[PDB]
Amino acid sequence: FQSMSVGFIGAGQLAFALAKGFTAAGVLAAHKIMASSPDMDLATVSALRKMGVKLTPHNKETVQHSDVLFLAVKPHIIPFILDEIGADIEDRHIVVSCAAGVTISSIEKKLSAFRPAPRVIRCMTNTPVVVREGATVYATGTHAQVEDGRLMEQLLSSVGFCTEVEEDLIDAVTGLSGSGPAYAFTALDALADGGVKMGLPRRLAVRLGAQALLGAAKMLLHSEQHPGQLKDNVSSPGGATIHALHVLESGGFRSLLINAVEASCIRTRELQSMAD
Amino acid sequence: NLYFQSMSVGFIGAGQLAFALAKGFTAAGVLAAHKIMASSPDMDLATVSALRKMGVKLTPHNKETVQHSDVLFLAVKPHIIPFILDEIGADIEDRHIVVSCAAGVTISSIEKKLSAFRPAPRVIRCMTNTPVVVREGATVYATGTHAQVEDGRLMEQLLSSVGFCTEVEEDLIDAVTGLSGSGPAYAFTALDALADGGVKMGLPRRLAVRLGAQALLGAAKMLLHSEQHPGQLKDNVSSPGGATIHALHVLESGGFRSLLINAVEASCIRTRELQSMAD
Amino acid sequence: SMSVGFIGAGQLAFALAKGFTAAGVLAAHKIMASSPDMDLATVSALRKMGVKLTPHNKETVQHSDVLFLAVKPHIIPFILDEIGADIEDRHIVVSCAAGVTISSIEKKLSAFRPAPRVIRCMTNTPVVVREGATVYATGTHAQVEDGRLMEQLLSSVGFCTEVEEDLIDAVTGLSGSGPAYAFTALDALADGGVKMGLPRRLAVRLGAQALLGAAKMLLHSEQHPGQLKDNVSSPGGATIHALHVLESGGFRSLLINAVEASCIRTRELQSMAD
Amino acid sequence: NLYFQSMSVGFIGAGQLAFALAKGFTAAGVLAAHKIMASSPDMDLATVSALRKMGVKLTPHNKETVQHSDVLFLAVKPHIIPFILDEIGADIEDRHIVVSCAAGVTISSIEKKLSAFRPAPRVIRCMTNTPVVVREGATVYATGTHAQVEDGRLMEQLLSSVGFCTEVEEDLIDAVTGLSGSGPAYAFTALDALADGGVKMGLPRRLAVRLGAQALLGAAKMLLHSEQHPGQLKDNVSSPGGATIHALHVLESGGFRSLLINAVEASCIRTRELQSMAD
Numbered sequence A: 001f002q003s004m005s006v007g008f009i010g011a012g013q014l015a016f017a018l019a020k021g022f023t024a025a026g027v028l029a030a031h032k033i034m035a036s037s038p039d040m041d042l043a044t045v046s047a048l049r050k051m052g053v054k055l056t057p058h059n060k061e062t063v064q065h066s067d068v069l070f071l072a073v074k075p076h077i078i079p080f081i082l083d084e085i086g087a088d089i090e091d092r093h094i095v096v097s098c099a100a101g102v103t104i105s106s107i108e109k110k111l112s113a114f115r116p117a118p119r120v121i122r123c124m125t126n127t128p129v130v131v132r133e134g135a136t137v138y139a140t141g142t143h144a145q146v147e148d149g150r151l152m153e154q155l156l157s158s159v160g161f162c163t164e165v166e167e168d169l170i171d172a173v174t175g176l177s178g179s180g181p182a183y184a185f186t187a188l189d190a191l192a193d194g195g196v197k198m199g200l201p202r203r204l205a206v207r208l209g210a211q212a213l214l215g216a217a218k219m220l221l222h223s224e225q226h227p228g229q230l231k232d233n234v235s236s237p238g239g240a241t242i243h244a245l246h247v248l249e250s251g252g253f254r255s256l257l258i259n260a261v262e263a264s265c266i267r268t269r270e271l272q273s274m275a276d
Numbered sequence B, D: 001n002l003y004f005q006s007m008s009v010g011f012i013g014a015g016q017l018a019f020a021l022a023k024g025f026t027a028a029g030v031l032a033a034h035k036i037m038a039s040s041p042d043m044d045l046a047t048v049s050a051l052r053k054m055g056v057k058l059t060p061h062n063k064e065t066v067q068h069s070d071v072l073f074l075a076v077k078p079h080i081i082p083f084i085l086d087e088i089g090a091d092i093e094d095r096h097i098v099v100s101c102a103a104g105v106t107i108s109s110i111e112k113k114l115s116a117f118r119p120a121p122r123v124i125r126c127m128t129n130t131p132v133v134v135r136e137g138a139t140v141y142a143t144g145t146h147a148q149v150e151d152g153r154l155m156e157q158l159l160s161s162v163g164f165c166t167e168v169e170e171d172l173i174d175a176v177t178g179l180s181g182s183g184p185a186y187a188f189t190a191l192d193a194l195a196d197g198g199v200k201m202g203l204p205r206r207l208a209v210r211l212g213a214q215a216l217l218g219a220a221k222m223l224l225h226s227e228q229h230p231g232q233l234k235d236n237v238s239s240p241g242g243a244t245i246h247a248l249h250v251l252e253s254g255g256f257r258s259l260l261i262n263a264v265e266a267s268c269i270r271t272r273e274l275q276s277m278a279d
Numbered sequence C: 001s002m003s004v005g006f007i008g009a010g011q012l013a014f015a016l017a018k019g020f021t022a023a024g025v026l027a028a029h030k031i032m033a034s035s036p037d038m039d040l041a042t043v044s045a046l047r048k049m050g051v052k053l054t055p056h057n058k059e060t061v062q063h064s065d066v067l068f069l070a071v072k073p074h075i076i077p078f079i080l081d082e083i084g085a086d087i088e089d090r091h092i093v094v095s096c097a098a099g100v101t102i103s104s105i106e107k108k109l110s111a112f113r114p115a116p117r118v119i120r121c122m123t124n125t126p127v128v129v130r131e132g133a134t135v136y137a138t139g140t141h142a143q144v145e146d147g148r149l150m151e152q153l154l155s156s157v158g159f160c161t162e163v164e165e166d167l168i169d170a171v172t173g174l175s176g177s178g179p180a181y182a183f184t185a186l187d188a189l190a191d192g193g194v195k196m197g198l199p200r201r202l203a204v205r206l207g208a209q210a211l212l213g214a215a216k217m218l219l220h221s222e223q224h225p226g227q228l229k230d231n232v233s234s235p236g237g238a239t240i241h242a243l244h245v246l247e248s249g250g251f252r253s254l255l256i257n258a259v260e261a262s263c264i265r266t267r268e269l270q271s272m273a274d
Ligand SMILES: O=C(O)C1CCCC1
Pocket: A100, A174, A178, A179, B237, B238, B239, B241, B242, B243, B244, B245
């Protein structure tokens, strides 16, 4: 539905990523998106502007334009935003919070002081929506209609994986797929360094490592097999791969990724307990 | 709209790599499965049973593969290659392009073996990986002494149908083995561990596996489609004070980057050993 | 015709006065600095510089329009008690002390005269060679010309930009303490040069030149520091081998640890003040 | 500045170093971009597009660069140097000053190759770094057997226009490689990490990169302009009980200093290996 009007409160990386993805998917026209920022001097705002997205310094204007309204500002700004534009949330609005940690309860508490049944959806998505390969989960609020969940899923499915979850899973999702791309970019940078150390040109090492990661991830998604089984299938006895896997194990490679997911999840919980 | 009507492909070996390439080529539409033949000394393999269902011609005799094939993939373990080349060396004809996929095995050693039977064998050395099974492989190749200009181009067209493919100098292939050859196993290990992390924080295992794999897929795709440095893309994910930068700190504190450097180095060095102790 | 004063005549006051006068934005004789111990080395160097000196904080307040507070943070309250009754309409109070909040300064000064004009800044010692890194936050009653004047004064001795006050403790961890990280790194790099056979004097020069040149490349490039690192390291080469050993020691994480530890200690100290 | 009046400069190799030096030299006003020639086997590189846009003459034939040049910089990987010396060695004339920038490659090895062509090749070995592109390089050079006295003076004046430059005995050069040759990469790693630290504590990435870069620049300039020991300047920054000494403790607990010593040693040792891998 290109007839949908979409707003973003916040014109940062995620607003840009989602707007880019939605327009590339054909589901929205760029000029049917409006975004607001208190800082119009950002680079993301210039890219949004170049895309044809409407830009304004007035959050109220984004709200009035919008049918689906994404909250795409830092968690600690969300209560101030709700104070500011709570009076302007209408019954027709679906309010979609993308802020890490921020609970449906806290949003509904603010918005309920104005109209009684604000339709609220909480989502955790990630920057690969920009190439329509995002990972998105969402939870529906108290007054979100069944059609609202399905509309949400349809829209976010256009830019990658999307599924409904209970809200108590979202902080963990944040630690896994929300922060996940950054772990991968770190990994890809390091793998390229290892390629370069062993004699590959940087450009080729970056390409090969990224292609290797894309292909393996795709294999797993399209396989009913355990990742341990796919790992077994790669490594011939006495061979190069199993030697590399040993040195990963000796440094506690697996545990570092578990540490990461946990640290991001826990911090996400602190961002909310800091608020409440 | 690529298709090789004249080309008969054979695999010496019917294991994981031969399966992956034949599945990729057939899914790409570039080869009919019935125009592919694979040989193996063990017809009781699951990969062998899977190639059957695809329609691949199977035989226990490597000489049959060679007689049926124009493009000949050596998909056996490196230490088996010399015995293979001794076995079928007298069956190599002018028409054959021998594509070795064995890790570490040099063009020099293959040409020396085959040249004892017939001069000017056309040899191509290849490092590819298992994601060719989903047409997202990463493949490099190096052309031998007697490989014609059309030979490498033909191999690039074919291997491009199942993922990234480019020509390299042969002395890069051991390093590519360490990076993209072994790379999928690094990723499978990472995805298992990330799923463990998701489970620890309360996600169901199936969802954690799906989300972690989607995250890696999307990130890798972002980088392939971006002109930006992976550090710059990393910067765009992490909000100041946020969850991501906290998690990045704990990766750094464990030397995460150095473990991946360590791995590429270890695989490449083992690959060089596999050769150096062959010859 | 601007009069600048310094409460405290230690390392930071000398650094700023030296930078300001080397910059040509202030005459040394228009600068006054007060100290409870006129026998510090920093006092002699300010004297030799042409700065006016005194042991009366009240004389400095009376002398100047722009008043820098360059004492240790636990002294700021006792300085504000001592001179709060002498702050005039004309005064801009610029606190350089780590952690001390605009709120707490305005509260002490407001007991004597309403609407004190207060600026909080975080700078560092390289202002002495006019390559400092300075941020500042404007107080409740700072006029708009106060901040712009502040940025003009401090841009003459390095980078200067306005920040929200809640960023300043982090800046302290990064560019406030940063020169000490860099001096530690330079000492160690020189040790590495000496171990590999270089004379100490040459190793210190080359290591310092390397860090300066790389810093300037980054400041002047639109590119990411990762991308500039890629450009240094040829495949299989010496640099990528050295980067591996830094990575195996968690080099990056130690620098993150440092910025965090300094920021957290800055927050800790202010909460002890509260 | 009579050295540079009508002096022509050539680059064998058009990679990062050739661009940085060419950009540095032009920005200093010592050479017009049109008086600089560069050769590269692959003109498909980015630096070759950047250089071409500078008004710099490119060519794929190193013999063209040799013919067009007085001072000839060898800016190719160390394993290529003896291959280049064989290619253009008969074209090296008495007028040429051959300035090798390849890490590890010894004056002796270059002179031995070129001495078979003409008896007294003028050879200078150089270790510089990428900040010559903003005229803040760190350069050392050693003069060869047949370099005339003006050659070393000419070399010093040229490289002084893009940063620090001093003559050294050649046996120090591998160590300088480990320190200031590789050093900017250490700084870029450090700056990326400091910026991550700033982001973790709530700073926007852009501001954190700028603040971290300015802190390093200011501290380096401070040390260069001070007669004081680095530890004394460190002491001046740290207030008792304060934030800086707390941060320095955590650096010390991770062996921060030993990592930098490790780095200089590792690069120096790798440089020595790249020399001995040649001869
Ligand atoms: O706080 C953060 O870093 C966002 C939540 C997951 C992705 C970014």
